[PDB]
Amino acid sequence: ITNFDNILFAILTVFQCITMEGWTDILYNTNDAAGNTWNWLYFIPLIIIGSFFMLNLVLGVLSGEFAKERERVENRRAFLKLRRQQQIERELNGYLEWIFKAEEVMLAEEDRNSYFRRKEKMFRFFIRRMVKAQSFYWVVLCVVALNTLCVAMVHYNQPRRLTTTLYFAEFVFLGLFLTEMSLKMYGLGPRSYFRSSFNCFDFGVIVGSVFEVVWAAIKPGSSFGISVLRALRLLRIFKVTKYWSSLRNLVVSLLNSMKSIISLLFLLFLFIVVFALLGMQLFGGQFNFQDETPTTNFDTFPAAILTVFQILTGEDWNAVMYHGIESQGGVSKGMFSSFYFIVLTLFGNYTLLNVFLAIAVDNLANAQELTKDEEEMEEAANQKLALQKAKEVAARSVWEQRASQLRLQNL
Amino acid sequence: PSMRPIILVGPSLKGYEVTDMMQKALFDFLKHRFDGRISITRVTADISLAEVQSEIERIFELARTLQLVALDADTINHPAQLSKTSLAPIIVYIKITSPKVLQRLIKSRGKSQSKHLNVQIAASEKLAQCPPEMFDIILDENQLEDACEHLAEYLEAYWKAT
Amino acid sequence: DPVRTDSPRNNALKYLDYIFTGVFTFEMVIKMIDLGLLLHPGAYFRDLWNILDFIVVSGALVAFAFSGSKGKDINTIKSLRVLRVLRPLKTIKRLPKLKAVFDCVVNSLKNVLNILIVYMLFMFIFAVIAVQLFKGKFFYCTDESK
Amino acid sequence: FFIYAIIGMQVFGNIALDDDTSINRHNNFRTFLQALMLLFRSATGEAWHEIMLSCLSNQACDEQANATECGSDFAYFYFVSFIFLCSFLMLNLFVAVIMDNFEYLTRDSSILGPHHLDEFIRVWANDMFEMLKHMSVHFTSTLMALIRTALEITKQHQCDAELRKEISVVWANLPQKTLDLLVPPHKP
Amino acid sequence: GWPMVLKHSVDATYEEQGPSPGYRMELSIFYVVYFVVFPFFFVNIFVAL
Amino acid sequence: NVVRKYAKRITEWPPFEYMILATIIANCIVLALEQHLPDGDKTPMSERLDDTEPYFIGIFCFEAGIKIIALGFVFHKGSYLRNGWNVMDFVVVLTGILATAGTDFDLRTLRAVRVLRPLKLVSGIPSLQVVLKSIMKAMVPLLQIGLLLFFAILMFAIIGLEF
Numbered sequence A: 001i002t003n004f005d006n007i008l009f010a011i012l013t014v015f016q017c018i019t020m021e022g023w024t025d026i027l028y029n030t031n032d033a034a035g036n037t038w039n040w041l042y043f044i045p046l047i048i049i050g051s052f053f054m055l056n057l058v059l060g061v062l063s064g065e066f067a068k069e070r071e072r073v074e075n076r077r078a079f080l081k082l083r084r085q086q087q088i089e090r091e092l093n094g095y096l097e098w099i100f101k102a103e104e105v106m107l108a109e110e111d112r113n114s115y116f117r118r119k120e121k122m123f124r125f126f127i128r129r130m131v132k133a134q135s136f137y138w139v140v141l142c143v144v145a146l147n148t149l150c151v152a153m154v155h156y157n158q159p160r161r162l163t164t165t166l167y168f169a170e171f172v173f174l175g176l177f178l179t180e181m182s183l184k185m186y187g188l189g190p191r192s193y194f195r196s197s198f199n200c201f202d203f204g205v206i207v208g209s210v211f212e213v214v215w216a217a218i219k220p221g222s223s224f225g226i227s228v229l230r231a232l233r234l235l236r237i238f239k240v241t242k243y244w245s246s247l248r249n250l251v252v253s254l255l256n257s258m259k260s261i262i263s264l265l266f267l268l269f270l271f272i273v274v275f276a277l278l279g280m281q282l283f284g285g286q287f288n289f290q291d292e293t294p295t296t297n298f299d300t301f302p303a304a305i306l307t308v309f310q311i312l313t314g315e316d317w318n319a320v321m322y323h324g325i326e327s328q329g330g331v332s333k334g335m336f337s338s339f340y341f342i343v344l345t346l347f348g349n350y351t352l353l354n355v356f357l358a359i360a361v362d363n364l365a366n367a368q369e370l371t372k373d374e375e376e377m378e379e380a381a382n383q384k385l386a387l388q389k390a391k392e393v394a395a396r397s398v399w400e401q402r403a404s405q406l407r408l409q410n411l
Numbered sequence B: 001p002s003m004r005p006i007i008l009v010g011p012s013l014k015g016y017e018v019t020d021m022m023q024k025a026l027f028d029f030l031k032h033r034f035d036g037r038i039s040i041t042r043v044t045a046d047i048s049l050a051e052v053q054s055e056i057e058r059i060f061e062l063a064r065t066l067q068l069v070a071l072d073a074d075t076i077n078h079p080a081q082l083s084k085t086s087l088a089p090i091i092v093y094i095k096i097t098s099p100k101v102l103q104r105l106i107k108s109r110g111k112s113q114s115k116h117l118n119v120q121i122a123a124s125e126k127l128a129q130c131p132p133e134m135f136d137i138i139l140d141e142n143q144l145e146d147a148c149e150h151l152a153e154y155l156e157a158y159w160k161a162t
Numbered sequence C: 001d002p003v004r005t006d007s008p009r010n011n012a013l014k015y016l017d018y019i020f021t022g023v024f025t026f027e028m029v030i031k032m033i034d035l036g037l038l039l040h041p042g043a044y045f046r047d048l049w050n051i052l053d054f055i056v057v058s059g060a061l062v063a064f065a066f067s068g069s070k071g072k073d074i075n076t077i078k079s080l081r082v083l084r085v086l087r088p089l090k091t092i093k094r095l096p097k098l099k100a101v102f103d104c105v106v107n108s109l110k111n112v113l114n115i116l117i118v119y120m121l122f123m124f125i126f127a128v129i130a131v132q133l134f135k136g137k138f139f140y141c142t143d144e145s146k
Numbered sequence D: 001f002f003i004y005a006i007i008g009m010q011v012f013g014n015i016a017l018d019d020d021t022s023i024n025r026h027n028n029f030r031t032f033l034q035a036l037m038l039l040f041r042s043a044t045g046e047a048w049h050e051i052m053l054s055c056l057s058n059q060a061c062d063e064q065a066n067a068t069e070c071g072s073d074f075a076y077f078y079f080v081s082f083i084f085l086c087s088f089l090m091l092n093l094f095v096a097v098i099m100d101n102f103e104y105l106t107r108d109s110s111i112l113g114p115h116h117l118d119e120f121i122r123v124w125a126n127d128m129f130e131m132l133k134h135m136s137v138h139f140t141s142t143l144m145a146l147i148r149t150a151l152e153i154t155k156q157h158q159c160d161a162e163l164r165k166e167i168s169v170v171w172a173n174l175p176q177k178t179l180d181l182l183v184p185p186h187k188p
Numbered sequence E: 001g002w003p004m005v006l007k008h009s010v011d012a013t014y015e016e017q018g019p020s021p022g023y024r025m026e027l028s029i030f031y032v033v034y035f036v037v038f039p040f041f042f043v044n045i046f047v048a049l
Numbered sequence F: 001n002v003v004r005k006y007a008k009r010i011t012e013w014p015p016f017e018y019m020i021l022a023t024i025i026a027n028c029i030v031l032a033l034e035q036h037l038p039d040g041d042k043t044p045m046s047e048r049l050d051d052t053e054p055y056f057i058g059i060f061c062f063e064a065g066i067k068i069i070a071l072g073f074v075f076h077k078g079s080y081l082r083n084g085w086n087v088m089d090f091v092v093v094l095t096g097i098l099a100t101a102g103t104d105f106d107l108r109t110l111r112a113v114r115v116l117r118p119l120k121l122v123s124g125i126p127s128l129q130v131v132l133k134s135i136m137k138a139m140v141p142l143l144q145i146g147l148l149l150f151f152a153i154l155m156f157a158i159i160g161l162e163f
Ligand SMILES: CC(C)CCC[C@@H](C)[C@H]1CC[C@H]2[C@@H]3CC=C4C[C@@H](OC(=O)CCC(=O)O)CC[C@]4(C)[C@H]3CC[C@]12C
Pocket: A145, A148, A149, A152, A153, A154, A155, A156, A157, A158, C124
């Protein structure tokens, strides 16, 4: 199948070389048929031009499309809505801290003068001051970092003492994190605990950890790897850095356009399903060759769906193509079944890249604009407040500059 | 008077939970910051109508000692409501610069103050229309610390002037 | 010649490398004398490029010292020869435009360093989950019936 | 590529060729061009992991190589670091090329550019009426006037003042009066 | 080589036992989730940054 | 003539289109459940999953009938076949009808168009249509890169032929 015997065969093998799949095997074949002195001048220019230069062109065109589309009236309006919501949340958090300080002073003055209720409320206020402290932050980070170390040392043929040590340490850490979650919910309040999304993730992870402990008690063998997700709480190490704003705004933009991300991952799923069903029709049951039945077949739906997913990721799509050609009669009469794989690796390589680069660019540009705008507003408000207080007592990236220019053009 | 009488206004009508608590946090900051230098007194006499007149002269003899006086009034929700009076108190304005965050504050403050949401937001908007010059101090800050430091700096400047 | 360790071409190139090492260590002593060592700022060892040049020259000198043709150690001499590959990494401090390109690349790396940390943490989490799944299970026989 | 090819020669260059491994007559480290071909193969991801496994410690060394054991577990770092360093440098080159042409990639049909200038050059072949119909002291001040009509900096005397200011900002290299000569013709 | 790693992962019976083709096919979800995250999402996050 | 065209438009009330969505998902599940065997063999469950087809073709004919009588067909400049998605549904249901012709050459190819039924999820969920158009509007500029790729492929294919 991989020969230059014909213009159609040559087109097919050059296309398979473009995708950089089995392109060195073709080069090695021309290194055996002829000398190796000149074959690289055909394949390395081929890879560079049709694979690295064309990917560069696609990236540039796609990024320009994303830049133009970002600075449109409705997309800009949605971003301004998100920015306004973030500013409102900041102001509301500050004022809530104000009102809680008022709570504390009122409770103190009332205690100096329902006794059970007052004691309970003062204890609740002490806990809410404790869970918000910088010492609680670091003790929880140390507990988490010690927990990841415990699961990092799990290996094959670990000592029996280590297995039991980590078995009991998992219980210790689960109890400590349940205590930490209960303390945070009591101090902050269950409505305010679930206010930040990362506490929602922590609650979900602790629930999953309890469920995994129960299931391991029921069925010892099965491990879901859910207790490992507590390692994601090391992402708070970023709160003591000047990079919390960017990463937090990235997560804010992701959670904002989550109903557009999930509906993007479902159109990809539907296209994968459609191509899996089409491959089931074309090659379903026809991969039972002599001496071998490939695991990458289209016989069932799980098999077809995995085969289509693997062709989308691009790896070894050519071997599946050779099987799908040889299943319809070989080179003589089955070579028009390569259009399935050509279409699936063309309109799947670039729709994957389109969708995921669109998600990444939209959300990272939203995060950039959010953090830049909050810093700009902070500095402008600082200047205004300093000037008024004195009154009463007496670079940029190419992307950002082009985005500003497109904003002026659209207005 | 020798020392201008410190009075807070700006979140919403007095008596309501959010306004009372924000103003009480500011008052407690002033009290534990200016202890021995400021006076906190609760007043039930409508200064805007100037039993009413009995308290104003009491305010002078607090203010006639070269010491700052802070007023816990309960009937003034306007700067011009005290413009016709001879006392002329300092109007420190705690500006919530957006009705949305104030509405969220009201909703968060239990369920009792939510039933008076419309009138309280209307009063906040009423204070919003007032020109900024009618208020002596504008407190746009979101944090307690920033607003308290702004007010404390202004009070230090006033103390140095007087 | 990676394979013909005793070929005449390698014998000629070892004398050539003698010449290049002589030139490099001469320039080394010139820089030491002129700029001055780490005892003050604005001198040698204040730049990582200077440290790179020094380690290249020192490694070449150590390899020459070990070249007694006694066979006592073989891995050390080969690794010290491999240390020579930083030698073309000298033409990048010398060229201003190559240095500008390198600094742009390093700035891009610094720009993506925060998400690189997140990526590495997520991959560590998936590595730990994959160990909890497939630990001790990737064993097989050449006889698929056992 | 040069650095990694030299290191590949010096560490993995004496591994014995084996057609049943990934160090073959085709994919060895035995010369600069062979090592550099191997690195290009790995950059495009052509079973680079199998090459790295064939480059590990305790491989059969070459018949003519004086060493007894050839290959090393340095291959893990060699191949992993080459993979992400090469990917990162590809990405930096790609983004540098894209951001060089980011004006063209975000070009709008309504806004002008090199295409409008080329079209007015073709107008040379009166014809200005037809071009203005087809639109989006001989040919240079006319181009300045076309830019004035497209983008906007009395009103016209202020425009001339801004044009002279820009010309003073962008004074040519060793010209007597090049842009200033166009200014007297571009004033109207 | 990721299809071979996926094949070894699904055809994985138990600790210190040999493979069994078609066993534990639900463990393909680990590599599907992995691909959606690192090759697809995170790599494009780097490209965007 | 027009007596029911005034009434069948209310038949597009949300429970009806949600029932259509549910039957579409059921068709997708039935398609997923099928297993293909080499040389004419059929699993016992494939017989049931092949006998369940006429229900799906009937329900899709029912939606087509409602959408053509309540709406127009081509004429009124707003109609059934003038919507790009309804063309796909019309093709699917028409080939479903042709799949019950009792002939020879139909089955091998008219069973293949049965795989466009999952895209009836997109055709029935307008939010998925909006997201799909957002995807596809960023790939119209890439058609020119497609021309460049095809030109490069022809150039290197001709060189490979020569050599
Ligand atoms: C802050 C977070 C990311 C903690 C992660 C720390 C890692 C850098 C450390 C912690 C535990 C370490 C592991 C602890 C135990 C082992 C097993 C060890 O395997 C053997 O001992 C093999 C031979 C045998 O079977 O005895 C190899 C290193 C490794 C993975 C260590 C490698 C480095 C690890 C992952």
